[PDB]
Design a binder for this molecule. Structure first.
Ligand SMILES: Oc1cc(O)cc(/C=C/c2ccc(Br)cc2)c1
Ligand SMILES: [Zn+2]
Lengths: 7, 261
């Protein structure tokens, strides 16, 4: 999975 | 230490023939692309599937903005095109979703769009694929596109949080050890798995960072052939281009391509 991050 | 100038001489000596390039939002900005932080409960919901399923309009608002033929590549894109035209580009990894790398003329086989593309779309329900052109009028008209098969929402092939990275991303596995130069433009690479990708180049390979600031894995696990050129990305690139003796080549390439855009 594409990692959760801010933006 | 190597200087920028040293890296530049390796390249002109065509001694760097297998440049792997990593890029992010710092190269979109100059084309006018709005930053993705600026109604949503928090800005990341824009790339969250549960929220998308609940209300896709915000996303589709952004799809309208970034849909192909709005924005154009800037001179940083064109520098990467020039690297490619010279036979020096092994692969270009992008975290951006504006598709400006392919508009700049870099062929799809040289690109890894790690967060997907507006070039195509997929029915969220029956998974039928669609060329992006087939949903363009709906998007341009502010109507959520629906599948002719099942009436499900048709979602542009942008990778949302939690979704698998594209297949092509696994070219990293051998692209990085295969590089004889790593170029990092307009991104920190703080987010995994990009961070770990910088570590996968061989020990002797220079890593050249052109970015506002020094951040992420090049700062935490520095190596002796790292070069960081900190400042506006565009201007850092303009400096490398001069040290390469490519300033006039860049002008002429941009003019020829701008003539076409
Ligand atoms: O002269 C060059 C130019 C270049 O782009 C790459 C390499 C090295 C490739 C490589 C791959 C796997 C293992 Br293990 C060890 C070395 C050498
Ligand atoms: Zn469907």
């Amino acid at each position: 999975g594409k990692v959760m991050r801010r933006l | 230490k190597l200087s920028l100038q040293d890296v530049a001489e390796l390249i002109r000596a065509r001694a760097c023939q297998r440049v792997v390039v990593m890029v992010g939002a710092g190269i979109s900005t100059p084309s006018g692309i709005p930053d993705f932080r600026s109604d949503l409960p928090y800005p990341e919901a824009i790339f969250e599937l549960p929220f998308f399923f609940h209300n896709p309009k915000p996303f589709f608002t952004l799809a309208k903005e970034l849909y192909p033929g709005n924005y154009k590549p800037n001179v940083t894109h064109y520098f990467l095109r020039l690297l490619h035209d010279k036979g020096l580009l092994l692969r270009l990894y992008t975290q951006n979703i504006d598709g400006l790398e392919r508009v700049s003329g870099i062929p799809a086989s040289k690109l890894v769009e790690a967060h997907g593309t507006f070039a195509s779309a997929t029915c969220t329900v029956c998974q039928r694929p669609f060329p992006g052109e087939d949903i363009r009028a709906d998007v341009m008209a502010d109507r959520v596109p629906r599948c002719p098969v099942c009436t499900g929402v048709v979602k542009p092939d942008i990778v949302f949080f939690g979704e698998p990275l594209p297949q092509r991303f696994l070219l990293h596995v051998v692209d990085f050890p295969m590089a004889d130069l790593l170029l990092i433009l307009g991104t920190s690479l703080e987010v995994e798995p990009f961070a770990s990708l910088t570590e996968a180049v061989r020990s002797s390979v220079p890593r050249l960072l052109i970015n506002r600031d020094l951040v992420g894995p090049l700062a935490w696990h520095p190596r002796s052939r790292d070069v960081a050129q900190l400042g506006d990305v565009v201007h850092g690139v303009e400096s490398l281009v001069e040290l390469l003796g490519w300033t006039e080549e860049m002008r002429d390439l941009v003019q020829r391509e701008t003539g076409k855009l």
